[PDB]
Amino acid sequence: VIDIYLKNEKEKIDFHFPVNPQDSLSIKKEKRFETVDIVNLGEFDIKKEGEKIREISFKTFLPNKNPIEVVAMLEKWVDQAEPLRLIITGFGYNGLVTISSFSNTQTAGREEDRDIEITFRTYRELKITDLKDNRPNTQTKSKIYTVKASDTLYKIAKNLLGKGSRWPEIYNIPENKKVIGKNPNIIKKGKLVIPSK
Amino acid sequence: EEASFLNGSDVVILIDGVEELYMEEIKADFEQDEQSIKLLGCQNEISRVGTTKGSFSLNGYKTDSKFAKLGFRSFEIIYNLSNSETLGYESIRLKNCRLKKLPLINSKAGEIVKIEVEGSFRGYDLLNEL
Known about the structure:
This is part of a larger assembly, with chains A (197 residues) and B (130 residues).
Chain A: E1 4-7, E2 14-16, E3 33-38, E4 42-47, E5 55-62, H1 67-78, E6 84-88, E7 94-105, E8 114-122, E9 145-146, H2 153-161, H3 167-171, H4 174-179, E10 192-193
Antiparallel strand pairs in A: 1-2, 1-6, 3-4, 5-8, 6-7, 7-8, 9-10
Chain B: E1 11-15, E2 18-19, E3 23-32, E4 35-37, E5 46-48, E6 52-61, H1 66-70, E7 75-82, E8 89-101, E9 114-121, E10 124-129
Antiparallel strand pairs in B: 1-2, 1-7, 3-6, 4-5, 6-9, 7-8, 8-9, 8-10
């Protein structure tokens, strides 16, 4: 039992590949090293501390959502800056990736179908004693928030914008200043509030 | 329905304008390298014509060193098939034909010395249409 799930986040879509990746899946691993050759001793291998960006490539076909819409969806995702979550069940792969190249093809027969040839890249985020910041931050929320009964603007700021002290960024928006009263502390249920960015 | 067929007994062959009556089998085909390509929109595959290549086979019973002496020189073969039940005849000529291999030697036991010739021809002319 092998399936491929692409769980996008910036667009809340969970694409499951209708058809398995044809002939074979393959994944390479290559350690980071570079030769150094010393006089009268010869070559030596020195490990480099980082890790490498490795690719997963395969090819499928989309049988008769329609294949046209699926191809459009994947082409749109190709330009996405945010990462996609790729899960391959039988193969055992699971992690954030991003599509480097995507291509579709129509054949003389089977014109409804679209033969697909897609490639992925491992994704890593740049964050630019205490707990390490190893967790990926891929969670998404709507750009407009409906205030609940128990919410306070600091609570909204922490839930929807991070540090919690980011509330003046929400308040200073003129639409938020209009829907919210002139007192930031007092807020009401139901009214819409727009987080920044 | 009526009997108007033709038999090989009526065959008359002029190899370079000379009656080689001893030949008891002849066949020639004019084949074409038809390219077959598949189009995007059409379910059915499209066949496009190509150049034509003439081939002929001619075997009979040896009576002389005609073909061995001939070698690979170009020559002509005029094939005439005549209807005897009713008047009328077909007459073909292979415009420029050459041998592919000389049957230099062939014999076995007490069997008659048979000769087989195979070759190619560039073109043809149709002189009689029945």
